[PDB]
Design a protein around this motif. Structure first.
Motif, PDB file in Angstrom:
ATOM      1  N   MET A 139       0.799  -1.187   0.000  1.00  0.00           N
ATOM      2  CA  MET A 139       0.000   0.000   0.000  1.00  0.00           C
ATOM      3  C   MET A 139       0.863   1.282   0.000  1.00  0.00           C
ATOM      4  N   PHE A 140       1.875   1.309   0.841  1.00  0.00           N
ATOM      5  CA  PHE A 140       2.702   2.501   0.965  1.00  0.00           C
ATOM      6  C   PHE A 140       3.522   2.775  -0.271  1.00  0.00           C
ATOM      7  N   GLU A 141       3.853   1.740  -1.052  1.00  0.00           N
ATOM      8  CA  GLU A 141       4.513   1.992  -2.340  1.00  0.00           C
ATOM      9  C   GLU A 141       3.629   2.837  -3.261  1.00  0.00           C
ATOM     10  N   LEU A 142       2.316   2.656  -3.186  1.00  0.00           N
ATOM     11  CA  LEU A 142       1.408   3.500  -3.960  1.00  0.00           C
ATOM     12  C   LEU A 142       1.275   4.870  -3.330  1.00  0.00           C
ATOM     13  N   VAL A 143       1.173   4.929  -2.015  1.00  0.00           N
ATOM     14  CA  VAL A 143       1.118   6.191  -1.292  1.00  0.00           C
ATOM     15  C   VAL A 143       2.290   7.081  -1.659  1.00  0.00           C
ATOM     16  N   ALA A 144       3.456   6.489  -1.849  1.00  0.00           N
ATOM     17  CA  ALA A 144       4.689   7.240  -2.203  1.00  0.00           C
ATOM     18  C   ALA A 144       4.528   7.997  -3.530  1.00  0.00           C
ATOM     19  N   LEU A 145       3.623   7.534  -4.380  1.00  0.00           N
ATOM     20  CA  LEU A 145       3.413   8.115  -5.672  1.00  0.00           C
ATOM     21  C   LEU A 145       2.283   9.141  -5.638  1.00  0.00           C
ATOM     22  N   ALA A 146       1.733   9.464  -4.453  1.00  0.00           N
ATOM     23  CA  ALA A 146       0.793  10.577  -4.389  1.00  0.00           C
ATOM     24  C   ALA A 146       1.524  11.874  -4.726  1.00  0.00           C
TER      25      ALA A 146
ATOM     26  N   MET B 265      -5.054   8.602  -0.698  1.00  0.00           N
ATOM     27  CA  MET B 265      -4.339   7.596  -1.462  1.00  0.00           C
ATOM     28  C   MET B 265      -4.194   6.308  -0.652  1.00  0.00           C
TER      29      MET B 265
END
Ligand SMILES: Cc1cc2nc3c(=O)[nH]c(=O)nc-3n(C[C@H](O)[C@H](O)[C@H](O)COP(=O)(O)O)c2cc1C
Ligand SMILES: Cc1cc2nc3c(=O)[nH]c(=O)nc-3n(C[C@H](O)[C@H](O)[C@H](O)COP(=O)(O)O)c2cc1C
Ligand code: NI
Lengths: 210, 207
Positions: free
Chosen positions: B32-39, B142
């Protein structure tokens, strides 16, 4: 239950904050209303639905916003410019928002009065700073949902804070109770001309487990 | 992608309760946090930090700071979403790769750093704090959609004592506690209908 993560991962990977927009990509109220139907389903504190959008399609108005937006030309080249507003007095609509619960017989009159009182007093007890914090917080949740909706619909966006809020309010006639939380341009960016995504901190530099 | 995202959004409900027997792992959350990093974040400053609590005694402490809400303890994890009021200070470090890899010369890099830093400094402390809340809130949304996509339920929460949370979790005053997010699996049959929603023509105006 089975492929939602891979689809969402692709959506997120493909979303880039636009640096430019291209002419010849008009956006319609219909395009936008589809995105806003999803935005309506965002969470908001106490279901107060703090967020408003002023959506500028008029090119003369966009030209006039350029100076207010720190001279950023993307306000002009964009298909539309949105001002994301947060109502600092959102809590005043608790009585109206919660009323259908009484009409449908989910709450009785006392329970409904109590619920309205809980929400109103939560805000009033905390004060003006909290009301404004809530405007910013809830509108920003909404804005992220807008941008992912746009991406899903095949449009590019750029979130923006590089603007004079006071100037924007004067130009667009926005009431005092609304915080101008952000600006979002929407349009079509030329993909061949994009710079690579800016450096990201690894997860282990922004998440602490306990 | 529109049909899939529409489905995801329509499904997502703020959890009222969480089921026991659904532990969450660092591997789950890291995805999940790998996607959050792309916010997106202002000036790519990446203002947001997450304190992710799995420890059950710490969750009991947090519950006491959140009006006794049972979902704090029944959750698989409780996240504290923080925003760095001094995020702008890391501009030079974040942009450094642009210079080192020769995308920008030194003058352009210095100009870029100074533009970001001065933007924040010239506005002042209220702005820095506004930016902590705004960028962390973008990030939180996100996070919630990422969790949804991964098959988890979440509940965003502001009903807590921020100063008590910072004491419990040893959080420096440089960080704003922006939000609490509980994560777990909801009893979906235990679900009230979605709270009333304003029509689009009551929250959008066109010009
Ligand atoms: C709240 C916020 C304010 C922003 N303000 C501007 C701005 O005024 N002008 C601009 O070009 N980009 C603005 N951006 C875009 C950021 O520079 C961008 O999100 C960041 O560089 C990461 O790029 P990516 O989103 O494509 O990964 C803003 C982003 C955020 C979330
Ligand atoms: C920032 C904000 C703060 C919230 N605080 C709480 C809270 O402390 N406790 C709680 O049970 N729910 C909390 N929620 C959940 C809202 O009540 C919920 O999002 C709203 O009623 C609509 O439900 P839905 O998101 O499922 O449609 C919060 C939501 C927002 C975004
Ligand atoms: Ni689904």
């Amino acid at each position: 239950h089975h492929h939602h993560m891979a689809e969402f991962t692709h959506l997120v990977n493909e979303r880039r904050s636009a640096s430019n927009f291209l002419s010849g990509h008009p956006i319609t109220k219909e395009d936008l209303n589809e995105m806003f139907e999803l935005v309506a389903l965002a969470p908001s504190a106490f279901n107060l639905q703090h967020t408003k959008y002023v959506t500028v399609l008029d090119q003369d108005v966009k030209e006039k916003l350029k100076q207010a937006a720190n001279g950023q030309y993307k306000v002009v080249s964009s298909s539309a410019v949105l001002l994301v507003l947060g109502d600092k007095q959102a809590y005043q609509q608790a009585a109206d928002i919660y009323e259908g619960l009484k009409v449908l017989g989910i709450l009785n009159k006392q329970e409904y009065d109590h619920m309205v009182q809980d929400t109103v007093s939560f805000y009033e007890n905390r004060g003006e700073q909290f009301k404004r914090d809530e405007a910013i917080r809830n509108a920003s949740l909404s804005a992220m949902m807008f941008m992912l909706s746009a991406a899903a619909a095949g449009w590019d966006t750029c979130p923006m804070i590089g603007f004079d809020a006071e100037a924007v309010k004067r130009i667009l006639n926005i009431d005092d109770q609304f915080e101008v939380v952000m600006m979002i341009t929407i349009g079509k960016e030329k993909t061949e001309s994009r710079r690579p995504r800016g450096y990201r901190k690894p997860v282990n530099e922004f998440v602490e487990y306990m």
